[PDB]
Amino acid sequence: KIPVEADFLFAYSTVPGYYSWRSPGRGSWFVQALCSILEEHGKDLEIMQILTRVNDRVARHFESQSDDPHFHEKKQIPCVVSMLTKELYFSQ
Amino acid sequence: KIPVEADFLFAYSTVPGYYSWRSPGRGSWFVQALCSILEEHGKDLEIMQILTRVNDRVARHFESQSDDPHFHEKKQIPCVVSMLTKELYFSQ
C-alpha cells in the first residue's frame, strides 16, 4: 500500500501567514522567477534544484516599492512543501 | 537584503492534520528511516535527496499494527518544507 497523501508537491509563492508580491507590469515575483529558471533548466535539473533556485532568485532579486512607506522595500521567500518519494526530472 | 524567513527547512514526520506513528520497540517510523538514510548517505547526498528517500522509506516500509481494527494497517508520509536558497551537503 501507498499513503493517499503521498507524491504531492506544493510550490507556494510565499510562506504561511505572509503576503505575496505582484508587479502589475511584470507579473508576480514568484512566477517571473519560476519561468526564468524553468526556461533555462527545466529539462536538466531535478524539481527541487529548480525550486531552490527559484527560492534564491525571489529572495535576492526582488524588493517591493510603494508610495506608502509601510509597504516599501519589503522582501519575500517562497515555500516548497514536498511529499515526493522520488526525484523528478522532466526529460527522458 | 535577505528575507527574515529565508534559509529554514522543516522536516516533519507527517503531513498536516495526520497522526505520526511510533513503534515502542523500535522507535518512530520517521526517525528509523531518517537515521538509516543518513548513516548510508548522510555525507554524499544533498539534503532534499536524503529527505526524499526518507519519504519513500516511510511510505513503503511501514504499516501500523494494532488490535483495534480502526488503527490497523495505517500508512504514513513525511512532509518536507523548504525555504532554503541553496543546495545543502554535509561535507567539504
Binding site: 535539473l45 531535478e46 534544484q49 526530472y89 526529460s91 527522458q92 | 554524499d44 544533498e46 535527496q49 543546495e87 551537503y89
Partner: peptide
Amino acid sequence: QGHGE
C-alpha cells in the same frame, strides 16, 4: 557535488 539523472 554531483547530481545526475
